[PDB]
């Protein structure tokens, strides 16, 4: 059965409303990201093929990597990413399978499977430690853009766990050098924990969409005093990054490029802290999207560092990457993508006024989104809610429950056009999160006889 190739619909473009990505032919692109940070540095050819194929099988269509993690970077074969500093003229050597030949392979294997590579050009650490100045950045961006501009399946990531006000001149030079040559790919900036690219780069012409990092601290988790880029006790409210990014004008799309990671300890500093679980992963995913993000990126502690036996992880990871492929949150992100692709895509907005009466706080805060003829409410705890059906068209509505851990659908019934009270039959605050789906009765986006929403690719 012919593998879906996203870019058969054309190159990626910011849609006219300023909220979503599409292909040139009008087709929605629902970004479902996986975090393969150390893919170029730690996997060999067979391993990379296996990783990429296992990601495809689970609906991911963007794989975020660190193209470089040091200056120079090393790969599993013992090849340097630079053999003469930032002079790239003799980087290809006849009869040597180099760092960049393996990068090429990863990109082209991904292309065969219909996956984009989210290329973090160079992670923030070496840059803030002085290892790429302004001239080095121009020479590197030029090298990247000339090598990869005609590869169909690239999205460029400037930054890498770094604030936009650190080494700004170096990041601008990298970004502008790439954009002077490569007119075929989009670009973003991946920022520091608890920050959004919008703060520094919303108005930057090289930046097509914004990205934030909501990971990896719990409510109230401080490790001393500094200036703190968020209000106290809002760490887990990743919907706040969405509202703050999209309030900046002109409006551009936004995504959580690094939420919490599955099995990573709360806050990263203590190896023995509570681990983030599947239910947390889902919460961050639905909260970001229902707040207005154009898609979501997922990660897992073990997969992102490609943990193997003999190579202990940061953040107390022991489980190999290849066994983390069976963990639950990794296997549940497809149900989000399949959901969002089931309904009219470009007219979707966030709308908390869909939720009437008194709303909960923290985890009990129900979150809603709608088109013109459908609405969706994500309830994490199961706390009773009131939903105003008059915010969408239709004199009668149909309603369903969608459970997010398995994509199952349960038809509720027909309803007139007022406020209505809803409460899912499941354990309260038990990680049995659910979406209330409500559709104008005249439309047929979901049938009444469906047990589940099928795969949209």
Binding site for ligand [N] (CB under 6 A): 19-21, 28-31, 34-35, 40-43, 64, 75-76, 82-85, 87-88, 91, 99, 102-103, 253-254, 257-258, 292-295, 297, 299-300, 303-304, 349-350
Is the Cβ of residue 162 or residue 420 nearer to ligand [N] in the bound state?
162
Whether residue 30 contacts residue 255, with contact meaning beta carbons closer than 8 Å, is answered with no
- d(Cα 253, Cα 240) in Å, to the nearest integer? 15
**Nearer residue to ligand [N] within complex by CB, 31 or 374:** 31
* Closest CB to ligand [N] among residues 85, 427: 85
DSSP secondary structure of 188-254: EEE--TT-BTHHHHTT-TT--SEEE---SPPTT---S-S--SS-TT-TT-THHHHHHHHHSSS---E
For ligand [N], which residue has the nearest CB? 292
91 or 248: CB nearest ligand [N] = 91
| 51, 330 Cβ separation under 8 angstroms | no
Nearer to ligand [N], 373 or 382 (CB): 373
CA distance 60 to 412: 31
Instruction: Name the residue with tokens 């670009």.
Output: 187
Tell the smallest beta-carbon distance from residue 244 to ligand [N] (Å): 13
User: What's the CA gap between 262 and 277, in Å, rounded?
Assistant: 6
In this structure, the number of other CB atoms found within 10 A of the CB of residue 231 comes to 9
Q: From the CB of 415, what's the least distance to ligand [N], in Å?
A: 26
Per the structure block, which two tokens stand in for 410? Answer: 């349960």
φ, ψ of residue 148 in degrees (nearest 5):
-115, 0
Q: Which helix (H) or strand (E) holds 368?
A: strand 367-370
| CB of 161 vs ligand [N], minimal distance in Å | 9
The Cα–Cα gap between 333 and 403 comes to: 12
Minimum CB separation from ligand [N] for residue 201, in Å? 15
CB of 99 to ligand [N], least distance (A): 4
Q: Which is nearer to ligand [N], 375 or 381 (CB)?
A: 375
CB of 332 to ligand [N], least distance (A): 14
In degrees rounded to 5, what are phi and psi of residue 189? -130, 125
Q: Which is nearer to ligand [N], 91 or 181 (CB)?
A: 91
SS (H, E, C) 242-293: HHHHHHCCCCCCEEECCCCCECCECCCCCCCCCECCHHHHHHHHHHHHHHCC
d(CA 338, CA 454): 7
Nearest distance, CB of residue 327 and ligand [N], angstroms: 10
Closest approach of ligand [N] to the CB of residue 267, in Å: 16
Q: How far is CA 59 from the centre of its chain?
A: 13
Shortest separation between residue 243's beta carbon and ligand [N], angstroms: 10
The total of other beta-carbon atoms located within 10 Å of residue 421's CB is 10
Which residue number, 33 or 382, has a Cβ lying nearer to ligand [N]?
33
Instruction: Extract the tokens encoding 59.
Output: 């609906």
First to last CA, the chain: 13
- Shortest distance in whole angstroms from residue 362 CB to ligand [N]: 23
Nearest-approach distance from CB 28 to ligand [N], in angstroms: 6
Buried b (16+ CB within 10 A) or exposed e, 114-153: bbbbbbbbbbbebbbeeebeeebbbbbbbbbbebbeebbb
Query: Which stretches of 30-130 are DSSP H helices?
Result: 39-42, 45-56, 99-112, 124-128
Residue 425 beta carbon to ligand [N]: minimum distance, rounded to whole angstroms: 31
Nearer to ligand [N], 177 or 297 (CB): 297
Of 306 and 380, which CB lies nearer to ligand [N] in the complex structure? 306
Comparison of 6 and 299: residue with beta carbon closer to ligand [N]: 299
Nearest to ligand [N] of 85, 357 (CB atom):
85
């Amino acid at each position: 059965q012919k593998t879906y190739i996203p870019w058969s619909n054309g190159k990626l473009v910011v849609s006219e409303e300023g909220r979503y990505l599409k292909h040139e032919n009008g087709t929605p692109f629902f970004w479902l990201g996986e975090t393969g940070w150390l893919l170029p540095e730690r996997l060999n050819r067979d391993e990379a093929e296996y990783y990429l194929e296992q990601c495809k099988r689970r609906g991911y269509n963007v794989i975020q990597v660190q193209t470089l993690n040091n200056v120079p970077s090393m790969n599993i074969y013992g090849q340097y990413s630079m053999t003469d500093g930032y002079n790239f003229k003799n980087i290809n050597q006849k009869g040597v399978y180099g760092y960049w030949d393996h990068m090429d392979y990863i990109i082209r294997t991904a292309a065969k499977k219909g996956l984009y590579i989210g290329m973090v050009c160079i992670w923030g650490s070496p840059v803030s430690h002085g290892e790429m100045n302004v001239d080095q950045a121009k020479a590197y961006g030029k090298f990247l853009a000339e090598r990869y501009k005609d590869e169909p399946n690239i999205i460029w990531f400037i930054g890498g766990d770094i604030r936009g006000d650190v080494k700004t001149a170096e990041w601008e030079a990298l970004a502008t050098s790439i954009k002077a040559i490569d007119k075929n790919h989009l670009m973003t900036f991946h920022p520091r924990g608890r920050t959004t690219s919008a703060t520094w780069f919303n108005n930057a012409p090289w930046l097509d969409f914004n990205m934030f990092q909501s990971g990896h601290r719990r409510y109230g988790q401080r490790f001393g005093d500094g200036d703190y880029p968020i209000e106290e006790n809002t760490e887990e409210d990743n919907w706040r990054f969405v509202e703050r990014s999209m309030a900046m004008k002109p409006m551009k799309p936004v995504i959580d490029g690094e939420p919490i990671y599955e099995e990573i300890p709360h806050g990263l500093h203590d190896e023995n802290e509570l681990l983030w679980k599947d239910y947390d992963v889902r919460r961050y995913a639905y909260w970001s999207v229902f707040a207005g993000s154009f898609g979501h990126t997922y990660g897992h502690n073990s997969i992102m560092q490609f943990i193997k036996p003999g190579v202990g992880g940061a953040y107390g990871a022991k489980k190999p990457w290849y066994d983390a492929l069976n963990d639950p949150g990794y296997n549940q992100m497809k149900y989000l993508k399949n959901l969002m692709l089931t309904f009219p895509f470009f007219e979707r907005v966030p709308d908390q006024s869909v939720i009437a009466g008194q709303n909960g706080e923290r985890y009990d805060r129900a979150i809603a989104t709608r088109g013109n003829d459908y609405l969706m409410v994500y309830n994490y705890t199961g706390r009773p809610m009131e939903v105003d059906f008059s915010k969408i068209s239709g004199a009668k509505k149909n309603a369903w429950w969608y459970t997010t851990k398995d994509g199952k659908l349960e038809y509720i019934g027909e309803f007139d056009n007022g406020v209505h009270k809803f409460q899912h039959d499941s354990g309260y605050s038990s990680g049995n999160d659910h979406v209330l789906i409500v559709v104008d009765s005249s439309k047929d986006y979901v049938k009444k006889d469906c047990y589940q929403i099928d795969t949209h690719e």
